[PDB]
């Protein structure tokens, strides 16, 4: 049976954290920062989708052509399999053609 | 798992409470309840 008996421990969340109070701060940096930067350059994380929405296929292709030279051996095979499957799926399967 | 179901038991109980006075395995099993409690209504 799925439903737990005891109610879970109550979650405290302090909304006046450093991150939760300084979220959003320094956005709109170009429109009132005399255009030194662009807010796509405040993005931190992976090297490829640093300001680029894309698809799943489009993200996998961009990740391969920006990273794949230094990606791991099993993973490069696993990404090449992923694009070899997605190119089949998006262009030869589905509705609307 | 992200966003798995948690309140299944009340959705089961809502069906079973109208079929509680039945015979056999219809009153206890869920899969056999909806094939009868629908016909009941």
């Amino acid at each position: 049976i799925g439903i737990r008996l005891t109610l879970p421990p109550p979650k405290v969340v302090d909304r006046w954290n450093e991150k939760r109070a300084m979220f959003g701060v320094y956005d709109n940096i170009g429109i009132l920062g005399n255009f030194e930067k662009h807010p796509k350059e405040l993005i931190r994380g992976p090297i490829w989708l640093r300001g680029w929405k894309g698809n799943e296929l489009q993200r996998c292709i961009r990740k391969r052509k920006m990273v794949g030279s230094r990606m791991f051996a099993d993973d490069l095979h696993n990404l090449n399999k992923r694009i070899r499957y997605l190119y089949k799926h998006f262009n030869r399967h589905g509705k609307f053609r | 798992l992200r966003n798995r179901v948690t309140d299944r038991y009340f959705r089961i109980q809502e069906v079973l409470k109208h079929a509680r006075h039945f015979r056999g395995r219809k009153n206890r099993c869920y899969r056999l309840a909806v094939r009868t409690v629908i016909r009941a209504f």
Binding site: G2, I3, R4, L5, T6, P8 | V5, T6, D7, Y9
Partner: peptide, 26 residues
């Protein structure tokens, strides 16, 4: 362990309804 609070709370309240049926207060 599911991620929930609302379903576990509804169960914990319904169990009170079942305790008041099995042994009611005087």
């Amino acid at each position: 362990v599911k991620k929930g609070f609302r379903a576990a709370f509804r169960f914990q309240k319904e169990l009170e309804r079942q305790r008041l049926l099995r042994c009611p207060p005087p």
